Amino acid sequence: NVNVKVIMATNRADTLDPALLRPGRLDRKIEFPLPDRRQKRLIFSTITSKMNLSEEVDLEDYVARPDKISGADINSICQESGMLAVRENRYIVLAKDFEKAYKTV
Amino acid sequence: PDIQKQEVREAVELPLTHFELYKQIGIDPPRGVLMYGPPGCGKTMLAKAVAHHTTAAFIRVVGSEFVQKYLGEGPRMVRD
Amino acid sequence: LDLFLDMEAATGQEVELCLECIEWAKSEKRTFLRQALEARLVSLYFDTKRYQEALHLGSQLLRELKKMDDKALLVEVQLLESKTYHALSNLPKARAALTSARTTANAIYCPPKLQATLDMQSGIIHAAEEKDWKTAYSYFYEAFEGYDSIDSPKAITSLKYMLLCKIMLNTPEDVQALVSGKLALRYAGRQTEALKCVAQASKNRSLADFEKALTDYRAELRDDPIISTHLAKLYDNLLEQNLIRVIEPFSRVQIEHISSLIKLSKADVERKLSQ
Amino acid sequence: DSIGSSRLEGGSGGDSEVQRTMLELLNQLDGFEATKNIKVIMATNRIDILDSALLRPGRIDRKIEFPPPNEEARLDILKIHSRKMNLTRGINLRKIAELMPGASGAEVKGVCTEAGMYALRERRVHVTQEDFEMAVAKVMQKD
Amino acid sequence: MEGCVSNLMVCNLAYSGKLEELKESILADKSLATRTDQDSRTALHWACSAGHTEIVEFLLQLGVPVNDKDDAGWSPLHIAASAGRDEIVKALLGKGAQVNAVNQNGCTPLHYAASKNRHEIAVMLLEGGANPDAKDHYEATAMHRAAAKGNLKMIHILLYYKASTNIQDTEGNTPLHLACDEERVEEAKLLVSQGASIYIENKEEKTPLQVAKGGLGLILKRMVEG
Amino acid sequence: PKNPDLRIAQLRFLLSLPEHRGDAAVRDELMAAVRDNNMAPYYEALCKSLDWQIDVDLLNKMKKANEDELKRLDEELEDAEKNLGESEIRDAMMAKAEYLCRIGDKEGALTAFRKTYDKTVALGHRLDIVFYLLRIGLFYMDNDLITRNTEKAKSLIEEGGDWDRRNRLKVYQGLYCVAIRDFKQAAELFLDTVSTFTSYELMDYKTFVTYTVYVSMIALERPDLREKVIKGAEILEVLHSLPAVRQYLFSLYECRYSVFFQSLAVVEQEMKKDWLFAPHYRYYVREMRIHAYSQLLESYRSLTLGYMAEAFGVGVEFIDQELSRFIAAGRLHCKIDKVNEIVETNRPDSKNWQYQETIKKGDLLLNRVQKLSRVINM
Questions:
Q1: Where along the chain is ATP bound (chain B)?
Q2: Which of A105, B51, B61, C42 qualifies as a FRET site for E107, CA 20 to 30 Å off?
Q3: What residue segments make up the domains of chain E, in order of their start?
């Protein structure tokens, strides 16, 4: 009898109290410790949809290497790559700026 | 003063634009969306994704502003 | 079937023959075949300007299409659905079907024939409510990129749609800039001449000349699409401009004297004014 | 009894404060008694059972096994949960209680509390078997 | 915004698909095709990207080296496979181009061929004597991406060459695991029926049965014992 | 009931008065007489029907069939009675009441629906029973009775609008507002046409559109049209049903009386010979005429007789007495003078009159404070 949407965010699943995780509240539970290929492909697809893409940019190495070494705030890293591409050295962003943004932070 | 974004999509935009359909199928739309893991950050990318996908009022948190010297302000604030 | 329908002869027995093909396909229990036959059939009814059984059987097709595989096939019938709903002039359902077609065809790469048709239709959809002419012009631009040099009628109607949507915002300079191009020079014909007359009448701000363009060229403008309403809307727009131009400084004046300059009848003028 | 949210770093000490409280309470009870009829019953869904076994290395305790969703134990409590909410007489609780073994009994309470919301949303004054079935499906979507 | 994709004139001309101006440029100067941009590529790469047959046939007629690579090591064959153009592949393979050429991540053109879901390109590439069992720097074959994008026909034509399914990724995930992760029943049953070993464990020590949900690993094991 | 026999029995109006349509009407009346136990309704309508020669033949079978079915329903009721259950007795009494609506007995249906009304476990089922009284209420054409249970079930809802429930109820509101002459307040009722679907229980979709097109075209002015139907795609979709409606709308919107008066005969013939639309056939015509006249005289002040006679395509002598009556009885605009042989108005209904709009309520308030002074001391 009301319209609202409440989403939750937590780092670990062993998080312990009698409030949020009580059965009957959350109808969706997703464990995401180690991002897979599909999720990376999609999350890079939505961020390459708005931003200008390129044919030289490969999604394979970026769906591969981060699966081994996984960092946080991917979109923020992409924004850092945008800060690398705001230097007006190159019109179209390439895999160089991405790899650099990955190795730097 | 493929499965992740689909599940989230069906847990967010589908309950938004569809009501009578859920009344027909007899399935209550899930309110919550859960994340996990130390490498996974989230909390930003997904929110902005929903923001671009659907146009509505979104509430972002600056952290806890309800912890102060005055404990009576909080309930009234969240009620407002 | 396609090569037979391209001949355009005896369309009366064609639909019945299609029914025989569907009955036979159902007899041999082939789902994809009869689905394709119905997909062509709804197009036949779309060309027959019948929105009843086309939408009904189209919906019945969608029901079994959504449950099965090959979502790429749904893009076509949903596009045609947007087309017939555009013929019925319904914004919400056509927009919903458009968005559905987009989120369906996002993963699978569509051919330049079907892909450009999406943007081509979308441009007309945005041109219906006349929200933003820029985005629409972009859609017609991409549609022109997809329809480029595949066929002569598709190309000339593509540039026709371009000049139309771009003259909706009334800038004849860019029209001249486009028709001055060598690339669109070989695609020129009797179709773009009327558009040049419209652009000329727009830049010269002439009424009777535009009426002449609606007079001599109407033999053609005979096959003109539903956009004729928008053309009449532009005509009535310029008419409104003139009416708020010459009448405004005159509080009370002779009607025949002020109509002497426009050299047209006062009937339709009085009608539009009173309206 | 806590499943939801903790820091586990400073929160472990925060819980250790309460554990120390019940520790000194048990030290008072073991020390002397002002009056009878004094007991304490706790619950833990996690390794803090073993942590309590570390805090209480087999000193004073009473152990009772608690399997989740045992059965016959599901039926009566399902009836209890069916006392408050409106339920028809044409529903079979047996098979729907036996439809979720090997997991837990909280799924049943979820099925119920949701079935109330299902009945309220479907504008039904009563709850049916199909409702319980769909609820079972929904709560088994997570697990 | 948009604009020129490169500083060089001949590259932008090759990308624009202008035949007469490019031929005029070559006839005027023969050293223009040997020039390199900031992306370390030539007009041939952009020509193969554009999908024009006449231009690349003319260039290959001039005898331009196909072994030329950029800073990222991208070969024209990779771009041709990514473009989804059959004629370009026919030309390159017709000139004797190396199919063993590797890029920055060491991914063979077969990977991009299975990525764009191009059957003809993959078949023609594997017909030239290419090795389907070849591994990249990440130690993964094209079967991984093929099973990841849910392509049955791709895996099928990859099995036409009798490619080994026993290739193990450095992560420990077999193509069967990716087939179960994609929740593809047909692909899983097929691969299992082809003799794929389900006893291979990853770094997470997770059996393929535990990977799939909905009792899919059960019928997989049923296909194993059956 | 929800059966087509309701409409078949609703055709009795056009079955009775005209002798032209009294052939096919009694034809499908007699044809549908063997369905849904139509014996009693056409037995009561027998006065408008043929002789007793072929009449008494089927009566013997229908009367025993009715008794058998009724006693079977009683048997099922007894089987449900003295037993543990809720929805069983509810559905039994409901179906029994439905059959009581089929035979055409209002008393039995009344007491049965009253019993199941007392047996209602919820307000939703109660509303369903209310609707069950409404569907037969359309046939019995009662007024206060059908509004009584709806006014009673109006308060204390709290469950919000449903899909087909609130929709069908909205349709009922549209119908009782079709019966009454209320328009402006009923203009919000047909806005639900988007979610409306084909209904064989009461009225078909195309029939509903055909019924509401009158109030939409007449009672609503041009700004209302542009705000609702012109902006909406509903009429755009349903104009393909018949070529007549589209022409009727376009001719009125373009202010062309030439084709309008030519097709006016069809509109008049379609207006009459209707169940609930019969008594209002005099009102809609006059209202549309005075609305058209007010619309034409809105943007026009001085009108010559020639252009008017050419526009309406009718004689001057008729519009003479027409406007002459629309002066006193019509009360639309100011006095018209024929001295110049040209229609010329003034209409100072704007400036002073806008301030003079409150003189009526002011005089009424004067009488009302005279009443307030009348309450004083006694």
A1: 37-44
A2: A105
A3: 1-226
